[PDB]
Amino acid sequence: IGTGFPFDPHYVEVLGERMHYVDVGPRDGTPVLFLHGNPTSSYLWRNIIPHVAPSHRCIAPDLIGMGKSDKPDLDYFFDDHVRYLDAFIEALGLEEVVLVIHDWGSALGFHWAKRNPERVKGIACMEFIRPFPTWDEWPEFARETFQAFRTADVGRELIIDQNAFIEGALPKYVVRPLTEVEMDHYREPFLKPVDREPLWRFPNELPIAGEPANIVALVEAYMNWLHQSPVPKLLFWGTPGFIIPPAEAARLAESLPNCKTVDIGPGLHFLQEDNPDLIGSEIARWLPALHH
Ligand SMILES: [Cl-]
C-alpha cells in the first residue's frame, strides 16, 4: 500500500484563509470531490485517487485546520467546517459533482447534498456518520474512549495535550499496521499541540445520545433525505467495521434507493487504509453510468 503523496500542491483563498487541495484529472467532465474526516487529510485518499483520475477530475481538500490548510483560531464546530467547505466549493466554481465521503467528510457531504440535490450525481460513501441514539449503540470497545473524549477537561488532555486521536485512535481503527512514514504524514499538521483543536471538537460534535442537539437534528435530516433520494449510492463496508457494522451495511443496501454495496474485507473505520485498491477500482468502474 503506497505511502507517498505524489500530488502537486494547490491552494485557494477561502474566507481569508488558504485551503490546500489535490486537483488532478481532466477539466471537462463531472469532478469527483473527496472529503476526509477526523483526524485525517487528503492523504487518506492518496491510493484511491489514482484509480479515478484517469477518467475524472479529482478534488480532495484538506478541511480548514487540517492537513496543509491554514489554521485559524476557530472553535472548529461542524458549522465552521460547513462554512469553509461551502466557500471552497464555490471558490473552485464547481457546479455538479460526484461525492466520495467518509466520517466527518460524510456529514459535510450529505449535508451539502441535501441542500444542493441537483448538483450531486452520485455518492460513494464508507464508514459515514449517522445518529447513535444511545451510547449502547456506539461500538462497545470504543465507548469508554469516546466518552472520555467528550468528558470535561479529560478529553482535551487526551486529544490536545497527549495527541490521543493521532497516536491512538487512528492506528487502532485500521486493521493493518500503519507504518511510521504513514504516521508521520498524519502527524505533520498537528506537531504543535495547540493546533489540535479540530481533533477534539469533532468527537464532541458526534451525534451520540442526543448530544449535541444541533448535530443530531441535521444528521437526522440528511439521513431522511438520503433515504428518499434517487441519487446513485456506492457504499463500501468492512468487517467488523466501526460506525457501519456489516448488519447495518446490509440494512442500508435494502433501504437506500439505488445503492450498490461493496465488501472490502477486513476493516474497522479508516477503510481506505485497509483496501484502497478495491475502493478506487470500484469507484472508477461505477462512475460512467452516472453521466447521463
Ligand atoms: Cl470524531
Contact call for residues 196 and 170 (beta carbons, < 8 A): no
Q: How far is the CA of 55 from the centre of ligand 1 (A)?
A: 32
| Fold exhibited by the domain 1-292 | Rossmann fold (3.40.50)
Concerning whether 127 is annotated as a catalytic residue, the answer is yes
Concerning whether 103 is annotated as a catalytic residue, the answer is yes
Q: How far is the CA of 39 from the centre of ligand 1 (A)?
A: 7
CB atoms within 10 A of CB 257: 12
Compute the distance between CA of residue 259 and CA of residue 232 in angstroms, rounded to an integer.
6
Resolution value, angstrom units: 1.3
Question: 292: helix, coil or strand?
Answer: coil
- Give the active site residue among 62, 80, 269, 282: 269
Residue 170 vs residues 62, 165, 179, 256: alpha-carbon distances, Å:
17, 6, 12, 29
Concerning whether 227 is annotated as a catalytic residue, the answer is no
| 246: amino acid identity, one letter | P
Compute the distance between CA of residue 268 and CA of residue 175 in angstroms, rounded to an integer.
6
Compute the distance between CA of residue 213 and CA of residue 230 in angstroms, rounded to an integer.
28
Q: How far is the CA of 292 from the centre of ligand 1 (A)?
A: 36
What residues does each domain of the chain span?
1-292
- Give the active site residue among 70, 127, 197, 274: 127
Cell matching residue 3? 505511502
Q: How far is the CA of 290 from the centre of ligand 1 (A)?
A: 31
Which stretches of the chain are DSSP H helices? 49-52, 78-91, 103-115, 143-149, 154-156, 164, 170-172, 180-187, 197-205, 213-228, 246-255, 271-274, 276-286
